[PDB]
Amino acid sequence: DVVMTQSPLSLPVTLGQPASISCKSSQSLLYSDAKTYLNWFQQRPGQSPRRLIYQISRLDPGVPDRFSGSGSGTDFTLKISRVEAEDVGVYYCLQGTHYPVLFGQGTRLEIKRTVAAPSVFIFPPSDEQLKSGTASVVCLLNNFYPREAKVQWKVDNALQSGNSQESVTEQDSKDSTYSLSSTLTLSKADYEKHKVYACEVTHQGLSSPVTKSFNRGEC
Amino acid sequence: QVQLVQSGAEVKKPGASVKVSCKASGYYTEAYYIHWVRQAPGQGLEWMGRIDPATGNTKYAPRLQDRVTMTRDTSTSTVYMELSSLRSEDTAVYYCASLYSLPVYWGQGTTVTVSSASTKGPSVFPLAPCSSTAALGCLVKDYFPEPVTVSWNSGALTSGVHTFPAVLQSSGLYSLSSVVTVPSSQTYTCNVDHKPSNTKVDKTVER
């Protein structure tokens, strides 16, 4: 099957810089006319996808001049001459020449800023939640960059795994930061057997892990 | 010029089948091939197949051929897509679109959730520190299905607000947190709305 290889998968770009995305097919997308059905699509966060370009280089209506397309046969490039915050999202090629129609794997485009270490906050469970059988404890990592971060949960110094879950924001258009939230779930009986609850955070912008904790009972 | 209108949100159980419709209208609706595309959470766009409304002839993505069917009704200029043997990785947004035309005409998206859970409105709990820049928030726990919408102070508070994507718990129920940064420098109420269960909660959080 024709195979589409988009490159790179993640594209952090300083505001105002140009950027390019590469798409390579396993065979030519030239069809029996002189026409080549390579298209480029964009999806911004929270929106429907839209086509940017059709037939390699032709702009769809509504698409600003900043986007341009090039290449031929098996090799294609999408250029953005000057990156704005409204260009944050995922970009896909789509081959329409050979069965089956096929999207590339996507290139995530984000804005690059200087490395910023998260601020960490820890929240014990509400006494209201406790009145119902479960304890959720929450760690917040606020306003950090780049997106990668690691949260390690400890309960009286036992490292927890398999019982947390986490979630990350879309990039803030203002400061280009991310925030993250992690929740540790315990039964109430387990929650009540232990004293010290900690979340230990590791990130590029921190010389050393930052740890926040509380003592159940002093709360 | 064509306009595509899809059927609404669906909740189905594992193993079952789902049928999504796409009503076409405009001049010569029969001349536009309708495609289906989907986007699972985090995942890339995946092309599922096309139907030619003229003849009813279909082409499918090979990974899905055994499980999906595309059908047409010419009197009602509607096309249908049925995905059988649903598993949880089929939970996603499904679009119909005339991908071949200039411009592409899109449906508005239909959300499909694969799950055994039944509808449940959320419990909302406060996120407050134990004891310059403080933080507080809301834990909107154990609801199903998505979405829930959250705001603070009926919308007057927007600066420093972060509402996170929902996570899906082992129980099949979703959970999310919404946090705000305030100065120590009065009152903060998070407004939570969950239309599938017609639930609305206004939770005031202290400190």
């Binding site: 069809y31 059905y37 298209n39 086509r51 059709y54 037939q55 032709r58 789509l94 329409g96 020449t97 050979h98 069965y99 089956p100 129609v101 | 001049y27 010569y28 001349a31 536009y32 096309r50 082409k59 991908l99 071949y100 035309s101 200039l102 592409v104």
Partner: peptide
């Protein structure tokens, strides 16, 4: 009839 009906593909 319809202009630009098949500019995105033939498959």
């Amino acid at each position: 009839a319809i202009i630009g009906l098949m500019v995105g593909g033939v498959v």
